[PDB]
Amino acid sequence: GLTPQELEAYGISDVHDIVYNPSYDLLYQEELDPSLTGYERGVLTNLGAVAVDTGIFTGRSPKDKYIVRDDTTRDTFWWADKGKGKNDNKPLSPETWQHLKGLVTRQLSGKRLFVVDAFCGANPDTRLSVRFITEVAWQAHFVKNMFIRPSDEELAGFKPDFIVMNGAKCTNPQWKEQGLNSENFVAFNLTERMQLIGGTWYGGEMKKGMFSMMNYLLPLKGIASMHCSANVGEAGDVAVFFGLSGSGKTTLSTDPARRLIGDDEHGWDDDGVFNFEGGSYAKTIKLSKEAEPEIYAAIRRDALLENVTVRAGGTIDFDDGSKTENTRVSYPIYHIDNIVKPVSKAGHATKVIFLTADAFGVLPPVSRLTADQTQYHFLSGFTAAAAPTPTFSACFGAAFLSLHPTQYAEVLVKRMQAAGAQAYLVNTGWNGTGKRISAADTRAIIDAILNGSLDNAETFTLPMFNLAIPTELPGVDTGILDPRNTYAGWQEKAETLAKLFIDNFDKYTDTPAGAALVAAGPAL
Template identity: 45%
Template sequence: MFDHDTLRSTIAASAGSVSHNDIVPVLVARALQGDECELTADGAVSVRTGAFTGRSPKDKFIVRDALTADSVWWDNSGAMSPAHFSVLLEDAVAALGGLNVFRQDLLAGADPRLQYGVTVLTPSAWHALFIRNLLIRPGEMVQTGANPTPVTIVHVPQFKADPARHGCRSETVIALDMSRNIVIITGTSYAGEIKKSVFSLFNFHAPRQGVLPMHCSANLGKDGEAALFFGLSGTGKTTLSNDPDRPLIGDDEHGWSDDGVFNLEGGCYAKTVKLSATAEPEIFAATKRFGTVLENVVLDDAKVPDFDDVSLTENTRAAYPIHVLPAIAKGSVGGTPKTVVFLTADAFGVLPPIARLTPDQAVYHFLSGYTAKVAGTERGITEPQATFSACFGAPFMPLHPTVYGEMLAEKLRASGASAWLINTGWTGGGYGVGKRIDIASTRRLLSAALNGALDDIAMRTDELFGFEVPVAVPGVDSKLLTPRLTWADAAAYDRQALHLAGLFRANFEKFGDAANAEPGPRMAQAAE
């Protein structure tokens, strides 16, 4: 059975060559030489990921052994036997034989006491560039710990697994051995699998160290107070946390320890669909940087990215180091959070643009992890569909959601942080009838929540959902704050609200009897 040193030396011995820690210009040149990419007019690296333009959650497996058997949330994770993992690892290593392998030795975790030393081995120069952009580069910004926990990721996108031989579902496999912190990725070129495998390891181990792992963005206020932004794809998490007046701690993955918040990564992986220089100037500028990796972004004849073209996928992405942004937090760390924000894009047009949550309500919405897909975003979707992803990142959470929920409850009680639900979705009707809440109003409401301007203003209690909603906020149309008033047909709003509340309750049933109790929607108060 391979340990980390043996695994790495075995790959080095059989590979045609191993390039150690190539810097960005070298990786770009090697990717071009290998015909893996093309350059945009500004020097960014444009790549295609082939058949897979997103993650393959059904092909993700965790080794079921003495460490994981009684702790992993198996309803959410595929199980692989240690024997199958060993055979898969041997075959993946053999598939690298004779190839030019790119090795990147990086860090995950800005807190040096809770750090991983991550070695990624891949035959693809652009994947090596991708992960170099996204993890922490030793010696840059963050202190290296005395004994980082070793992690090895064997990335062989061209290798096709055999379900009969490897105990998997298809030719694509993302397999994690939590006991040894070894990851195997085969059969997919989508680079996000590398990034998220590190997050999954962290999410399994962090709670044992008293650290809450979080799929969220984080930034700092003028007095150094931290704010957290949870939200599924398309809710505005990256956009709203990138604020030139609030230094960014990190874009996507964090830990909350007794000392505060720390970033797991050293880069950003931003969605670029319909990216605008006006609405998202910092991200737009990053896409023009030499060495930024653009995934599945269509280029025009002049090699200029067309962010409105989603002919390949709506999941177009840009991967770039965090230091290219104009305002970042020193050391990628922050103090204890003062504000926690849950973002949703409610395509039903029911939820208010902002609501204040009690600690119990905050945990409820954290465990619910709600947003909605709109018609046309995926094949077969003709009307809004509710999406619930526990902890706003269920695919990456190996433990049961209540483990993380209980930790959040403890953190909120200890910190006294305020919690807010912000809807960046629709008003005046659902998708196709109403309109998207304008970004300017969202930013005003968010700013008011962050700077304390909403602490003492008049609030109404939503009769169905139970949370508090501001009656009026300077600079925001007061009608917008009461969604029912924005609908032409109030009765239609009531029906839609009941429908959404029912979806919340049905989803929450997997957590037991609490589904029918506070702090969820108060269905008994409204007649069908």
């Protein structure tokens, strides 16, 4: 356990009472305290889980995200104002940092505090020790679910590498004079190793804040940091899946014959692939027991519902998206049966799958990527909607990148090469006309990848993009393998898309890495 004196080292004073690493039993009682008001208030649902409301703080606040620019980060961070920018990594002065830090420590002074020590990363040799301090019980509950809970033995020798202080109740009145976006703030200081949260009550800021920090620390050590889901087969073969909204990442990574390592954040070190998290933060709009039985069943006592509509009686209305469509629920990973246990990690990945939804109808259902193409497409992070509106998210998670995108690509292929892994580009999209690709076909494609069939298969190249397409695939109509067969014609569309890729990639050509990669992209 820790003493009040330990917290005063951070600037907090007059510490009334500390509840260190509270059990789920205690948190449940705390959340239901009738004296709580506003966003602190918790309500019991018919499913047994507690539900909370974060007001207008429905999602992340990229505009209020700042990182202190100093000797530590000056030359290493991917700044929003240097070179070509193109990101939310806005620099902050050390003096303003001390002011923001002071606002939080003063807000937390003279209160009963909740302190949660946890780990980020499932592999002991490469994990990060994090201490979270909050004055709100459900916030302590959120971090207990989302990060790895230490054993009493691990707690004995705990020494935090990073400290996050949640001061949602305070705001910065001097914001205007300081040249900030608003009175709220999500700030990071890599020299003092701390994260501050002010004004915003959105739980995801704690999850995504640590992800951004891991994205900085790990690649520097030669450890891949990835925004993906990962699962394992009976033979211990592991696959990682990358894909933005609509790509079907989650659904395709759900397989009764394959245990889940994790659904969102993973690292890849000398020992293999590991989950950063100890829980899942799932979206709940239109959630049905029929479509998502695993998630639905995870919602019980100890899970924490966020912003969902609950009626006086009858309770949860998962369909009500009037307030927001970003309704969430967090729960410890063990609420899911089909997982890798007792530790969320496995061996080296041998199959890397990039999922996309090409509404332009140009890309093939499946292509086997070359090492350079893997890097090119990882950096592009393409997907399109409504058909078509294209989206390019670097490394399939641009908003959480702390280093130049090329750095993530380099470490990824380094680990892939050491494992002899193979990458595939799978297009589950439709241009809006004629017969679309069926879920059955999509599953057949994934099976062919996972079982090693496409690994040494004969292929033919697709013009311009130069993608290698397998000659035939078991359980799939050979006809659908060639995207041209759906239609000048395809060529005209291919030129349009190729131009988009080229236009987007110019953002990284300044670096020797990005520059060298241009030759792996579309040739028009």
